Ligand binder design. Sequence first.
Ligand code: AGS
Ligand code: MG
Lengths: 646, 268
Amino acid sequence: SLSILMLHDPEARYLHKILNLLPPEYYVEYPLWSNVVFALANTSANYRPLAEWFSQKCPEKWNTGGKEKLEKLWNDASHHTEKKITKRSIMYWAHKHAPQQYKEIVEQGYFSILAEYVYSYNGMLEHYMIAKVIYAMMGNKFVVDVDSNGKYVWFEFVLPGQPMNQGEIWKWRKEVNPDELHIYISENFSRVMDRITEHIKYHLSQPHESNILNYYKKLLKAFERSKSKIFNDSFKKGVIRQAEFLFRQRSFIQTLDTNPHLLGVGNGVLSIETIPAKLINHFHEHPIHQYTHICYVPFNPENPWTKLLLNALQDIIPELDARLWIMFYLSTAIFRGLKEALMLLWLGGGCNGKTFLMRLVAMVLGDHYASKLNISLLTSCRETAEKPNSAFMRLKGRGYGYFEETNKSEVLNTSRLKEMVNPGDVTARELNQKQESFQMTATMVAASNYNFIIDTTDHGTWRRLRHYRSKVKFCHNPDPSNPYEKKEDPRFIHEYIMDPDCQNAFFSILVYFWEKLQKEYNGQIKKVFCPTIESETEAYRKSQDTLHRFITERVVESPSAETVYNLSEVVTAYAEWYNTNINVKRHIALELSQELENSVLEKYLQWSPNKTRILKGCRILHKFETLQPGICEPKNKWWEWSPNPS
Amino acid sequence: SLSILMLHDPEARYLHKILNLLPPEYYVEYPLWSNVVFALANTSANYRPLAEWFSQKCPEKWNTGGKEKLEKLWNDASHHTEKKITKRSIMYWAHKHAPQQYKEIVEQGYFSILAEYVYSYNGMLEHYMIAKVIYAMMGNKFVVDVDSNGKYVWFEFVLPGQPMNQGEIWKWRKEVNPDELHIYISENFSRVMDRITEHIKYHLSQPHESNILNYYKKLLKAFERSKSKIFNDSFKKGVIRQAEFLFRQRSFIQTLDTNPHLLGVGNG
DNA sequence: TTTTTTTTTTTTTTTTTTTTTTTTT
DNA sequence: AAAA
Ligand SMILES: Nc1ncnc2c1ncn2[C@@H]1O[C@H](COP(=O)(O)OP(=O)(O)OP(O)(O)=S)[C@@H](O)[C@H]1O
Ligand SMILES: [Mg+2]
């Protein structure tokens, strides 16, 4: 039904004019004829005859390649979507390979549209007809959408070779007013206007009877009076008001920045969807707007900065397995999608260089994807009633959260922490607006030289937690006796972050590590057995437990004795214990009404017939009360990751 | 390809005219000449042949000097990010060393621009024409940028010889509305209006065929009717609301006062 | 727990309109 | 000179 499409849509025929400029080898290329049929698939569905016409377009080997081959990709499912290239991109392949003939095709294209309107209304232009001409001419560059509060917001696609803020190439940007459209409607639209002027004068040159003696003269007078209308301001404001509907595109704002496999970079957009990661520095159709100003380059260990960073980094963390495991964890900061609930906190001392690593990642990732949050938030000690809260926000879309030191060692209640790590959704509010929910997908790190008090026993609480301790410390007198001591550079933090190449080198390392973990056991973090890690963590679990310490301080090593009333004094005995052993405090005592049974006291803990859980015997201690009776060091390179054991 | 240089771009031919009347002693010297090479290189990369011809202004340096070194300098300036010294500076040296000649050159330039618009639209001026003509002159001052709050903001370059605040000289200042731009467009633009009127009446003086019996009469009537528009409040407000698009400079507010090696003082 | 966020603006007209002199009756 |  080629004729059908021809008559059904003049644009379809124009679209046919433009597709005739494609060389036959384009139709030969297997992934390309799949691309074009998919591109037309997402734009309407009645173009099956046109798609079938494309099967007969340069069919030098259609029978050789299979008659039921190109149509099969569309006839198998006229429904269904793939989130692929739509229209307004086929024009890009058309003009990138067939110049000149493309510019005249579009030139006569809107020329017919404009010349139709000038004849139909005796040369009396208006706002809407101009808006239609503009959209058919530069409708493949602008998108208008409506935000949450509701205004007609303008988004512009940046192209190389035009004034633009650094790092904002090959991606959409927000515009308060389409300013460059205002100059565009005044300069390039004039050229279209002139072609009309020549056409009417040429027809006036050809003699004829009264049908042209006054009719052409009237239009010329009307047209010239209307020629100056375009330069007016209120008229130009009206055209922008009209064109808002033509450039309207439903479902564009909420699909912005949704793909977690696309990252905006200073030299295009970086795709981590497939291995290896690929850089896009040409036209595409992915709705991405946020970015960071760090240019991406392929990972080269031969760069002096890459070696410089790797050497200092390797010295910072001595253990090979710990070094691999930590950076693999930090490599997830590039990802912006759902992540497994892992909390990383680790201990150090003095000028340990902890601040250097967090600071490096934050600027490398950029503000759009990384941010600094109040350390108090981690404590979770603070509670928020029905009141605005801002620091809870800012976590949207981010993939990295880093903290700093506290006043001292701090206690962290499970509340306000369970939802900070879990792959769930949380809701809150702040200045203005109201309650709203947002998916949390950011990696979390918080290291300090202060131990974090944890008062619980639940496995679910102590399953999304990992602990580490630093061992290498920096001092200005590095005696050559202790390996855990190295010299410092004041420039190392004050500068070396201001060098863009350092960020470019560091970002490459992060990309490479994420590729390694992805090429590793299908992602995930639970694997990679680092004996140094997860052992100090459970050692920290054997510590940081007041009850267990109390158990093997007063009742254990003296269980054969018998000074027991009930669960009541055991709490008081535990109360006075932590009062001195730790600090004086009180609790709604029901926690031990079951935790004590959850403990190892069952040897003597047996509930009496009238409940009271009378322990079979212990010795409450007063006065001194003693004598109571009861890895491979890497050869030369470790970023190469070594074989599977590593 | 000098003909290609002078063909595709009237801005290039204007830069050709400005490139003349220069003190070639500076071109002979390495520092200042390299500085102006950097200035022109930072202003787009499409002007590679024009920069090459700038190497052939007083060709002695291109015949006695680092030819390949100079072209490599221009190339690296094109593909590097620096402080980005731009135009409106070579204009400064041209005015500094060479008064007179440049004044009538720019006068003829924007006068020709306005005359071209008048002849194109039968002397029916409109806000865009006046806005572009105004941007053709001035331009050095009046940088416009969009704040973080979404409000257009105007900035003026303070110069000696005006009523300014204390210690505000030789640096940008914030302006709620370009008031002295308003009075400038009211006063100085009238000189161009008068020059155009004189040119029209002079052409009317010369005798010709039936064109002058009615056609110049129509042109002069339309121009006279449009003359009073520049004094209208709504017309001038529209002219400003059109012109702030042209004087827009991307990435200006956030890069303001960023340099820690520069201090603002009373005497500069 | 006010406190400051909330309130409460806050743009608020503006364009235009009319005419528009010329034109052409 | 008056109406569009
Ligand atoms: N890999 C490295 N190479 C060279 N110098 C380093 C390295 N790591 C740390 N340093 C030096 O040691 C210092 C870093 O320690 P600090 O940042 O002071 O300690 P921190 O644990 O990060 O937290 P602070 O700052 O002590 S509260 C810097 O002054 C660096 O000069
Ligand atoms: Mg530090």
